[PDB]
Amino acid sequence: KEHKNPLWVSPESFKGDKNFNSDIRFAKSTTLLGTAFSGKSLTGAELPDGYYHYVVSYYPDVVGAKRQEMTFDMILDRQKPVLSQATFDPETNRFKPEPLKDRGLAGVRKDSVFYLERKDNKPYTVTINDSYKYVSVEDNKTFVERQADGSFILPLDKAKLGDFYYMVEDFAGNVAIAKLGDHLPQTLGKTPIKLKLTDGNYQTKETLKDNLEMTQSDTGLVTNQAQLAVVHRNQPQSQLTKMNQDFFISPNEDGNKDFVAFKGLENNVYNDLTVNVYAKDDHQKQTPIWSSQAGAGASAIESTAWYGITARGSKVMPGDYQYVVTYRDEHGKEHQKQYTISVNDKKPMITQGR
């Protein structure tokens, strides 16, 4: 409560004018996305789920003025709500979950039940925005009203019983969805039944496609690759590629060569793996610009992916850097693999042709 021990501080500071808005061309508010907190601490470590204080602090531009702050209470919750049991009354079509309960602190914010209206013999919809050159896909979710006692009269008219989904959302955006498919072979019509729900582990993102199978003739470095668009503004399909040539990265999340990572031979042991990044002028490797966290493994690439950042979070300057890898095998000190990556985020210069 004293704000003495800070777990993270934004690397940039900001200064600006009052939102005085004398005419339209003067904004009435200012969004400062540089103050973004993503649950990672001052060294890149991940702070655990819990209660936090998100504190914004600033100074009037008057000398001798006390620093002002403003505190938002704020939860970290990475835990989906729980789906335990439900009751289905085949005599009313009445679907009634057990308790609403969340894992973590955010708490359950909403119950819902939906089936997928099949339209065009597909269950989703692709909408193309021809003016901003952007395509979006969205399910054809069609929902079932929630009665006041928290139950749902399932319209078995419109979708098979097992083709409904029960969805529970907590604040902070954890979602648990369960299709009613942990069912009973020949039980409708008869007595009410208690039904088991398990979250179907649906997701929004699916991470990079590995499929690489390292040889020893490889440096061990890997990076990403993606075909960068010319007209559209969707996110292109990116895949991993071995480096062993051209130790450079473009850290701009463009999809392409945005990070250096290390992957071991798939059957060698790298127990207690650590990646450190030092600068070109630190020829003794004392002071790391960036470091991996605990639990770094040579098979989880995100544990070793240096994205041209300092640990604190900000982007390194263009120039040469040292990416030093250390591990111990079935016998140890079989480490210190020294790569020298340079950065350069300047798009090249197309000269006119003949």
Q: Determine, following the binding rule CB under 5 A, whether residue 104 of this chain makes contact with Ca ion.
A: yes
Query: Pattern of binders to Ca ion over 157-186, x per CB under 5 A?
Result: -------------x---x------------
- Residues β-bridged to residue 306: 260
Record the tokens describing residue 57, joined without a space: 């602090």
d(CA 183, CA 187): 9
Question: How is residue 351 annotated by DSSP?
Answer: P
Nearer to Ca ion, 108 or 301 (CB): 108
Please, what is the minimum distance in Å from the beta carbon of residue 53 to Ca ion? 19
Residues 58-77 close enough to bind Ca ion by CB under 5 A: 77
Please, what is the minimum distance in Å from the beta carbon of residue 78 to Ca ion? 7
Torsion angle (degrees, nearest 10) of CA 166, 168, 169, 170: -170
Question: How is residue 323 annotated by DSSP?
Answer: E
Query: Residue 254 annotated as binding?
Result: yes
Helix, strand, or coil here: 37?
A: coil
Nearer to Ca ion, 79 or 326 (CB): 79
Q: Determine, following the binding rule CB under 5 A, whether residue 258 of this chain makes contact with Ca ion.
A: no
**What is the secondary structure of 187-244 as a DSSP string?**
-SSSS-EEEE-------S----B------TTS-SEEEEEE---SS--SPPPEEEEE-S
Please, what is the minimum distance in Å from the beta carbon of residue 152 to Ca ion? 22
Query: Residue 77 annotated as binding?
Result: yes
Q: Identify the residue among 8, 76, 97, 102 touching Ca ion (CB under 5 A).
A: 102
Q: What is the CA angle 314-320-323, rounded to 5?
A: 75
Q: Identify the residue among 79, 87, 112, 310 touching Ca ion (CB under 5 A).
A: 79
Query: Residue 79 annotated as binding?
Result: yes
- Whether the CB-CB separation of 222 and 212 falls below 8 Å is answered with yes
Annotated binding site: 77, 79, 102-103, 169-170, 250, 252, 254, 256, 258
List of residues contacting Ca ion (CB under 5 A): 77, 79, 102-104, 106, 170, 174
Annotated binding site for Ca(2+): 77, 79, 102-103, 169-170, 250, 252, 254, 256, 258
